[PDB]
Structure 1
Amino acid sequence: TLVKQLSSNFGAISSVLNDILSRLDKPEAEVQIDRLITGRLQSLQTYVTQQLIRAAEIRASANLAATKMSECVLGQSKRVDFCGKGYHLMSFPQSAPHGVVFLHVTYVPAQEKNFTTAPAICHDGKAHFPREGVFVSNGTHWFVTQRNFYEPQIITTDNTFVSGNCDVVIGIVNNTVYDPLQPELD
């Protein structure tokens, strides 16, 4: 666009300076030239202004790319959807002609099952809460499992902690919590 503007002839008799100078006696040529200078100077100013604005767009992108490099390649980000959909594990950069390409490796949950749950287990009047897991049931037995992957464990005193009584908890269920030392102590 910038180059083509040179042929515009911005109100002048000709877009070509040599034709203006050849055809005219000079006093008029200066006027015809001023018209071309004004238009051509305006064209450069237009070009540069747009380049400054576009440069800002790229700068912002580069700052984002640099941020991603630091947080997704040189570490493991916990920012949701910052480094791909799913739970971020790692990423690998690849170069590109005028930019960077990130390959984001994420963990995505699949094949969920529906379990019955509860906030706590009532054992001998004590409210047992899970440690780093959730209480689930298959309709019969209750188990405790890590929230993000079904891997049911027996509910024991090593998988829970005790706070208060069982009257305060809204949806507590009755069950037995196993003490691993019971068969060794008695």
Structure 2
Amino acid sequence: LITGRLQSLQTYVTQQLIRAAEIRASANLAATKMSECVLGQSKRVDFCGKGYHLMSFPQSAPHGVVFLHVTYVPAQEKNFTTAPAICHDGKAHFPREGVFVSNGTHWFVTQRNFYEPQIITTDNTFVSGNCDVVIGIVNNTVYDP
């Protein structure tokens, strides 16, 4: 009887140690979530919510934590005709931030994650070399103030 009950107790303690290791791994993950998403903003993809992570709100739970990850997702995409660069007068023009798009007639610079069309101005672009090595560069005029 002593040997059987001692083996039963040892089995229970071993399973409890296994589950404690798993729970400790989960709690380390939860602490990392609290530090890197509640106390700041994380650029890690899918770490905190599906989409670009904005904020996280922590709430308690019985033997656990719950996070309300509030995130940003695009909603309505639209097709556009794009080019890597613009040859204005023999020199290429690459955008600083955003991309070159066109609705069919005119070309605009746009932010990478929202449609904010702007006229082509020399403060939105920088020049680099001539327009004969870039593959797919189109021809347009770059306005300057």
1:162: how far off?
0.2
Alignment of 1:85-124 (within 5 A): 85-124=50-89
Count of aligned pairs: 144
Cα deviation digits, residues 125-169 of structure 1 (max 9, x gap)? 010001111000000000000010001000110100000100010
* Alpha-carbon displacement from aligned partner over 1:90-131 (angstroms, at most 9, x marks no partner): 000000010000000000001000000000001100100011
SS at match of 1:115: strand
Relative to the length of structure 1, the TM-score reads 0.77
Cα offset, 1:59, TM superposition = 0.2
Larger radius of gyration: 1
Q: For residues 48 and 140 of structure 2, what CA distance do their matches in structure 1 show? A: 42
Aligned to 2:76, what secondary structure does the other structure show?
A: strand
Provide the C-alpha distance between the structure 1 equivalents of 2:76 and 2:135, rounded to a whole number of angstroms.
Answer: 30
**Structure with the largest fraction of helix:** 1
Query: Under a length normalisation based on structure 2, what TM-score does the superposition of the two structures give?
Result: 0.99
* DSSP-derived class of the 1:154 partner: coil
What is the alpha-carbon distance in structure 2 between the residues aligned to residue 147 and residue 65 of structure 1?
32
Identity of aligned residues (%): 100
Q: CA RMSD in A?
A: 0.4
Alignment match of 1:50 (pick from 11, 15, 38): 15
- Which consecutive residues of structure 1, in runs of 5 or more, have no partner in the other structure? 1-35, 180-186
**Cα offset for 1:83?**
0.2
The whole-number CA distance in structure 2 between the counterparts of 1:131 and 1:173 is: 17
Tell me, what secondary structure is at the counterpart of 1:49? helix
Matched, 1:168 2:127: no
List runs of 5+ in structure 2 lacking aligned partners: none
Q: CA deviation at 1:42?
A: 0.4
Q: SS where residue 75 of structure 2 aligns?
A: strand
CA deviation profile, 1:46-93 (whole Å, cap 9, x unmatched) = 000000000000000000000000000000000000001000000000
Q: Distance in 2 between matches of 1:98 and 1:173?
A: 60
Residue 94 (structure 2) aligns with: 129
Q: Are residue 63 (structure 1) and residue 33 (structure 2) matched?
A: no
Report what 2:106 is aligned to.
Answer: 141
Q: Secondary structure at the match of 1:42?
A: helix
* Rounded Cα–Cα distance in structure 1 between residues aligned with 2:86 and 2:46: 35
Quick one: distance in 2 between partners of 1:88 and 1:175? 37
User: Quick one: higher RCO (CA 8 Å, sep 6+), 1 or 2?
Assistant: 2
Q: CA–CA distance in 1 between the matches of 2:41 and 2:29?
A: 16
Distance across 2 between alignment mates of 1:110 and 1:126: 36
